[PDB]
């Protein structure tokens, strides 16, 4: 791997919207990143808590799998887990931003439930 792989990896897994956006753009052109041999696989929100209202969290689950799979392969999952879990929560709250009134509250409550599940069983 290239010697700046750790920096790149860190840049795609911060909690901010610009880090989420940098990752989406790279996910869209995986081929430009082949030299880095990242694991791009994802099972979306499989094995997550129930989502009766259908809030669309698949993109957030995807970036969360990217942080877990790639930090485990780098041998530094324990030291970075909690950031990846928090970035997951921030991605989900950015989804909930498009709902208002009670729906926002319901979205936020499902997002917290997802966050807590990875925080505890991750």
As measured in angstroms, the least distance from the Cβ of 41 to Ca ion is 10
Size of the site for Ca ion (CB under 5 A): 3
How many Cβ atoms are within 10 Å of 75's Cβ, its own excluded? Answer: 8
CA-closest candidate to residue 98, choices 56, 51, 49, 53? 56
Query: Site mask, Ca ion, residues 31-70, x = CB under 5 A?
Result: ------------x-----------------x---x-----
Classify burial at 53, counting beta carbons within 10 Å of its beta carbon; exposed 0-12, middle 13-18, buried 19 or more: exposed
Known catalytic residue: 64?
yes
- Position of minimal CB gap to Ca ion: 65
Residue nearer to Ca ion on the CB measure, 107 or 118: 118
- Assess contact for 65 and 27: CB atoms under 8 A: no
Whole-angstrom distance, CA of residue 114 vs CA of residue 57: 10
Whole-angstrom distance, CA of residue 24 vs CA of residue 34: 15
* Catalytic residue selected from 13, 26, 64, 65: 64
Site for Ca ion in 62-121 (CB under 5 A): 65
Sign of the CA dihedral with 53 first, then 58, 61, and 63 last: negative
Residue nearer to Ca ion on the CB measure, 101 or 121: 121
Residue nearer to Ca ion on the CB measure, 4 or 43: 43
Residue nearer to Ca ion on the CB measure, 9 or 118: 118
Residue numbers at the binding site for Ca ion (CB under 5 A):
43, 61, 65
Q: Which residues are catalytic?
A: 64
């Amino acid at each position: 791997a290239p010697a700046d792989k750790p920096q790149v990896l860190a840049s795609f897994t911060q909690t901010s919207a610009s880090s989420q956006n940098a990752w989406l753009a790279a996910n869209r052109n995986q081929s430009a990143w082949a030299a880095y041999e990242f694991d791009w696989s994802t099972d979306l929100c499989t094995q997550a808590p129930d989502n009766p209202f259908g809030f669309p969290f698949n993109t957030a689950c995807a970036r969360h799998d990217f942080g877990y799979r790639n930090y485990k392969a780098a041998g530094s999952f324990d030291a970075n887990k909690s950031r990846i879990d928090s970035a997951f929560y921030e991605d989900m709250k950015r989804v909930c931003t498009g709902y208002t009134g009670e729906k926002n509250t319901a979205c936020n409550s499902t997002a917290w439930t997802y966050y807590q599940a990875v925080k505890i069983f991750g």
